[PDB]
């Protein structure tokens, strides 16, 4: 018979299976859609997570309660030494992708 009291699901089925990642480095599943009218640019970069710290921000958010006031926010520092470009891969379109 039915549940006497309704309750939503614990957890999301979108993130199944709850297994270990197949690689240590994160995979870009999708890149932004190419527009040939745009100037040439790169879509991604790498860095190393160093830690986090605290800031004070001077907020300019009209309509908000903390507008023209100071707010304390958490921020994460990513150490980013410059990358080195060493290669070029070409991709064609096929009926299999």
């Amino acid at each position: 018979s039915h549940r006497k009291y309704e309750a939503p699901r614990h957890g999301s089925l979108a993130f199944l299976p709850r297994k270990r990642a197949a690689r240590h480095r994160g995979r870009v599943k999708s890149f932004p859609k190419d527009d040939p009218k745009k100037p040439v640019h790169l879509t991604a970069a790498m860095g190393y997570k160093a830690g986090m710290t605290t800031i004070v921000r001077d907020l300019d958010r009209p309509g908000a309660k903390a507008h023209k006031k100071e707010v304390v926010e958490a921020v994460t520092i990513i150490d980013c030494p410059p990358m080195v470009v060493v290669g070029l891969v070409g991709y064609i379109e096929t009926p299999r992708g």
């Binding site: 309704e6 309750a7 605290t54 004070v56 309660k65 903390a66 006031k69 100071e70 707010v71 304390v72």
Partner: protein, 135 residues
Amino acid sequence: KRGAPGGKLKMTLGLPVGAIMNCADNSGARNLYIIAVKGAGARLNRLPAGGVGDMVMATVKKGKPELRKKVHPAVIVRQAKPWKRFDGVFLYFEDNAGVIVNPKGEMKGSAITGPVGKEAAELWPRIASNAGVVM
């Protein structure tokens, strides 16, 4: 219009249903017993709770006798559970206390004993008009 105020930022709720707070005005009541919180959501087994500036429904357990038979709207002006403001300041008061109001937010009493919270003062203009000190 229900008594839940608009333009309130998220804060740590310190007073669930069943909590007895002090009565900070001179309406005659000495304490307020929470039985409901305005604007509370629906969730299984979760007790409704409110913070400073929230409206609750409270009965009087101790005080003037003709106040003891009704359920009054009240605004929580002080809480003892520490909470954070947007300037990064964590703070708390030494007691939990509220004031009896009507659903329009106007106070039953005429004076407030002790300080009130900035959230309560900014959300209810009559409490800011009847407060002697705002912290």
